[PDB]
Design an enzyme around this catalytic site. Structure first.
Site, mmCIF file in Angstrom:
data_model
loop_
_atom_site.group_PDB
_atom_site.id
_atom_site.type_symbol
_atom_site.label_atom_id
_atom_site.label_comp_id
_atom_site.label_asym_id
_atom_site.label_seq_id
_atom_site.Cartn_x
_atom_site.Cartn_y
_atom_site.Cartn_z
ATOM 1 N N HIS A 192 0.804 -1.209 0.000
ATOM 2 C CA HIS A 192 0.000 0.000 0.000
ATOM 3 C C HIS A 192 0.845 1.270 0.000
ATOM 4 C CE1 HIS A 192 -3.309 2.703 0.627
ATOM 5 N NE2 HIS A 192 -4.171 1.704 0.689
ATOM 6 N N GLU A 240 -8.241 -3.443 -0.720
ATOM 7 C CA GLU A 240 -8.684 -3.770 -2.066
ATOM 8 C C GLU A 240 -8.849 -5.283 -2.227
ATOM 9 O OE1 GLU A 240 -9.207 -1.383 -4.903
ATOM 10 O OE2 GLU A 240 -9.374 -0.110 -3.112
HETATM 11 C C1 LIG Z 1 0.794 0.045 -4.274
HETATM 12 C C2 LIG Z 1 2.126 -0.737 -4.304
HETATM 13 C C3 LIG Z 1 2.928 -0.769 -5.584
HETATM 14 C C4 LIG Z 1 2.904 -0.551 -2.971
HETATM 15 O O1 LIG Z 1 3.573 0.722 -2.972
HETATM 16 P P1 LIG Z 1 5.127 0.589 -2.496
HETATM 17 O O2 LIG Z 1 5.576 -0.893 -2.057
HETATM 18 O O3 LIG Z 1 5.207 1.368 -1.239
HETATM 19 O O4 LIG Z 1 6.164 1.322 -3.496
HETATM 20 P P2 LIG Z 1 6.961 0.248 -4.404
HETATM 21 O O5 LIG Z 1 7.328 0.793 -5.877
HETATM 22 O O6 LIG Z 1 5.992 -0.838 -4.660
HETATM 23 O O7 LIG Z 1 8.195 -0.471 -3.621
HETATM 24 C C5 LIG Z 1 8.976 -1.277 -4.523
HETATM 25 C C6 LIG Z 1 8.928 -2.721 -4.092
HETATM 26 O O8 LIG Z 1 7.552 -3.259 -3.937
HETATM 27 C C7 LIG Z 1 7.609 -4.703 -3.977
HETATM 28 N N1 LIG Z 1 6.243 -5.276 -4.201
HETATM 29 C C8 LIG Z 1 5.103 -4.704 -3.785
HETATM 30 N N2 LIG Z 1 4.067 -5.461 -4.151
HETATM 31 C C9 LIG Z 1 4.542 -6.512 -4.797
HETATM 32 C C10 LIG Z 1 3.943 -7.605 -5.404
HETATM 33 N N3 LIG Z 1 2.618 -7.722 -5.407
HETATM 34 N N4 LIG Z 1 4.720 -8.536 -6.006
HETATM 35 C C11 LIG Z 1 6.056 -8.415 -6.025
HETATM 36 N N5 LIG Z 1 6.655 -7.366 -5.446
HETATM 37 C C12 LIG Z 1 5.922 -6.407 -4.832
HETATM 38 C C13 LIG Z 1 8.649 -4.930 -5.058
HETATM 39 O O9 LIG Z 1 9.166 -6.262 -5.004
HETATM 40 C C14 LIG Z 1 9.713 -3.914 -4.715
HETATM 41 O O10 LIG Z 1 10.586 -4.491 -3.702
HETATM 42 P P3 LIG Z 1 12.136 -4.656 -4.210
HETATM 43 O O11 LIG Z 1 12.577 -3.611 -5.357
HETATM 44 O O12 LIG Z 1 13.202 -4.786 -3.005
HETATM 45 O O13 LIG Z 1 12.186 -5.981 -4.884
HETATM 46 C C15 LIG Z 1 1.626 -2.222 -4.166
HETATM 47 O O14 LIG Z 1 2.732 -3.075 -3.854
HETATM 48 C C16 LIG Z 1 0.920 -2.783 -5.440
HETATM 49 O O15 LIG Z 1 1.508 -2.807 -6.521
HETATM 50 N N6 LIG Z 1 -0.324 -3.247 -5.265
HETATM 51 C C17 LIG Z 1 -1.085 -3.820 -6.387
HETATM 52 C C18 LIG Z 1 -2.069 -2.792 -6.955
HETATM 53 C C19 LIG Z 1 -3.348 -2.674 -6.125
HETATM 54 O O16 LIG Z 1 -3.318 -2.434 -4.920
HETATM 55 N N7 LIG Z 1 -4.454 -2.847 -6.837
HETATM 56 C C20 LIG Z 1 -5.807 -2.788 -6.283
HETATM 57 C C21 LIG Z 1 -6.756 -2.417 -7.414
HETATM 58 S S1 LIG Z 1 -6.626 -3.557 -8.840
#
Ligand SMILES: CC(C)(COP(=O)(O)OP(=O)(O)OC[C@H]1O[C@@H](n2cnc3c(N)ncnc32)[C@H](O)[C@@H]1OP(=O)(O)O)[C@H](O)C(=O)NCCC(=O)NCCS
Ligand SMILES: CC(C)(COP(=O)(O)OP(=O)(O)OC[C@H]1O[C@@H](n2cnc3c(N)ncnc32)[C@H](O)[C@@H]1OP(=O)(O)O)[C@H](O)C(=O)NCCC(=O)NCCS
Lengths: 363, 363
Positions: B251, B306
């Protein structure tokens, strides 16, 4: 903490600029005065919308597109009447417009769209006004102008060359006026990849409010109380002695005089002698502005737009009820313009707030 | 220049607080988890609305007032069908609600009002859903709960003790969630001494957008692709190798895990074994969260709301189309609450902007 966000500049835009200090207001690079005075609403719209004045052929097509989208869809005309008698022409405009929202209106708003809206708004307003007044409905006609057609569908007659030229210059000045409550409302609303309609519908809902585009009733009465120029000074003079204030003057944001109010007084002079309700205003102004010099010397108090908006209406028997709507139909340009731009390079208005209340312990 | 106003705190409020760092979300002094888990939507609403949980008698009356305002006025029911087949249940909700605006809705919004809205929303949603689906309309009934009635008018049946308890806890979590696009939209709109309806209508229009309360389709598919727990790891494992991301996790604002997502997984356990679509989720979660530990060690990635919103729906055959609406009907509380408060001590959101365009010379 920035209460009401005063002084907070959350937007970039090439649509309009308002400069309190220097007495000037600019639409896409040109002066409002100039557009109000020497152009037609349609030209104006086309400017705020696209960025320049239109070519001789460039325009004619725009009109066509407009003139065509003035007709009220079958079910819309019907809906307006579904709506019960207890509904401001405003509460309605807001509703009806929303009724237009379909699938056609998706995230990226489209000119096609911005147009329909701009063009149809007055029609809604009117057909509704008529119905409530038990008058027979009047269909728009690809034959008159835009500002002129608005009159026609409301009254059934063709306005005085003066009555027309005036109103037009008015609406044009009401077209766009920087970032304000509603215009900001739409942007905010479109902020979540929403539709043009949902934005306008929002803005509209926001206009209804009395603190934005409310009738200058306070002024309208001033005039209505002295049908003849003779009583000019008399009236003013009286309430100016125990310190009562003269309604159409002075401004919060315009240190120097208001350009809008200015661009109006001017058009009026041009069409003087053709409209008593107007030539009276002219006088009242000039006779009141010279009395302010006298009673309150120094304080540069200049006639403010609100004043003339009150006058132009007075001339065309547009009672207070039709004010905001009419205004809306105009700012409608400003909105779309702003919407269309908000979408160009979006954002996410997520602002935050300070919580008062007490918090519970994790325990 | 503060683009999108991130970090800009333009509001004071005692309705709710969201704290990224510490994994907590508070409603009027209580924790959301607690309200979601151990209370009924109605209790919840009553909290966000007034400020405390309700007394044993205090509540029963609130219900009554609600149950009573669920009926769709004669002309409204009719209108919903006037509206052509090309109109999202959303484009409609927005419209219809606006249709409610009358004279009764003036500047100072009233609880009487905030209530009608909250209570009637689901009905609109439903009657509409039914009509489009050519099903016969189902009238609400003062006999069931609120969240339960919403199901009934949509399906015609009474939901599983589990199917119910779940949804309810869900909606409650969707009720209020600080300052967000829409909620902010309403405030802004009411900013000009406007009406509750015009505000909700605004907010609604703002919800339609896909960036706010859109269905978790991305997740819904994840689940739909593995009806049985066996294929649990298999699936995850695959797309987790070429680095594809697992949809319901991580998140932007919650550094620690999401309380909402949490309060959900919990209620689920309570009613386990009674709903395969739910007990599956449970598994998928637990089996996926332990795979993130493995493939991406360190990065505290926790299940996000979500995810479960996607699950609860999946369980009640609420296809993606009914998502946002359902969500709206809930955030509806949050809104009113926020509206009712905005009006307590108003403001004037007049923010300003930077003009790009070139300016003309005074000459
Ligand atoms: C929203 C987000 C990207 C989280 O924000 P943040 O983690 O704070 O910012 P980020 O760019 O993601 O941090 C980068 C890291 O997230 C990790 N990560 C987060 N979610 C991951 C996932 N589902 N699968 C693999 N890696 C993930 C990455 O591996 C990366 O870690 P490393 O570079 O050390 O390998 C979330 O992880 C995500 O993508 N969620 C899916 C979208 C969603 O919530 N959809 C709901 C409506 S369809
Ligand atoms: C909007 C406002 C108050 C102008 O803002 P500002 O002049 O910048 O801030 P103010 O509080 O007015 O400045 C104080 C001064 O204004 C003067 N003033 C402004 N308008 C005046 C008026 N109509 N009559 C008498 N004095 C006036 C006061 O005399 C005072 O000057 P002094 O104390 O030296 O005597 C404007 O003058 C006004 O009241 N307009 C009428 C309301 C209006 O525009 N209505 C339209 C919708 S009905």
């Amino acid at each position: 903490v920035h209460y009401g966000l005063k002084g907070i500049t959350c937007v970039e835009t090439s649509i309009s600029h308002i400069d309190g200090e220097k007495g000037r207001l600019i639409y896409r690079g040109h002066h409002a005065k100039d557009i109000a005075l020497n152009h037609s609403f349609e030209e104006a719209a086309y400017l705020i919308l696209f960025g320049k004045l239109p070519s001789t052929e460039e325009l004619q097509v725009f009109k066509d597109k407009l003139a065509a989208e003035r007709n009220l869809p079958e079910h819309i005309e019907r809906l307006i009447q579904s709506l019960p008698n207890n509904m401001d022409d405003m509460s309605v405009l807001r509703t009806v417009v929303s009724a237009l929202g379909e699938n056609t209106y998706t995230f990226h708003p489209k000119t096609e769209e911005a147009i329909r809206l701009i063009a149809i708004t007055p029609s809604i307003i009117a057909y509704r006004k008529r119905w409530t007044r038990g008058e027979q409905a009047i269909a728009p006609s690809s034959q008159y102008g835009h500002v002129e057609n608005y009159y026609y569908m409301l009254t059934g007659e063709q306005p005085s060359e003066a009555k027309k030229k005036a109103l037009e210059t008015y609406m044009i000045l009401a077209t766009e006026h920087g970032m304000n409550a509603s215009t900001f409302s739409a942007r905010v609303t479109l902020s979540t990849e929403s539709d043009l309609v949902s934005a306008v519908t929002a803005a509209l809902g926001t206009m209804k409010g009395p603190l934005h585009g409310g009738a200058p009733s306070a002024v309208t009465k001033m005039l209505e109380d002295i049908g003849e120029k003779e009583h000019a000074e008399a009236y003013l003079k009286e309430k100016l002695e125990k310190g009562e204030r003269l309604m159409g003057f002075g401004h919060r944001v315009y240190k120097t005089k208001d350009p809008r109010a200015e661009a109006l007084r001017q058009k009026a002079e041009e069409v003087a002698g053709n409209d008593r309700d107007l030539d009276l205003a002219l006088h009242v102004e000039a006779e009141a502005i010279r009395l302010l010099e006298i009673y309150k010397p120094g304080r540069k108090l200049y006639t403010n737009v609100e004043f003339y908006a009150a006058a132009v209406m007075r001339a065309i028997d547009f009672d207070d009820e039709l004010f905001t709507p009419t205004f809306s139909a105009s700012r409608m340009v400003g909105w779309c313009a702003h919407v269309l731009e908000q979408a160009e390079n979006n954002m996410i208005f997520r602002p935050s707030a300070q919580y008062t209340g007490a918090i519970p312990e994790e325990v």
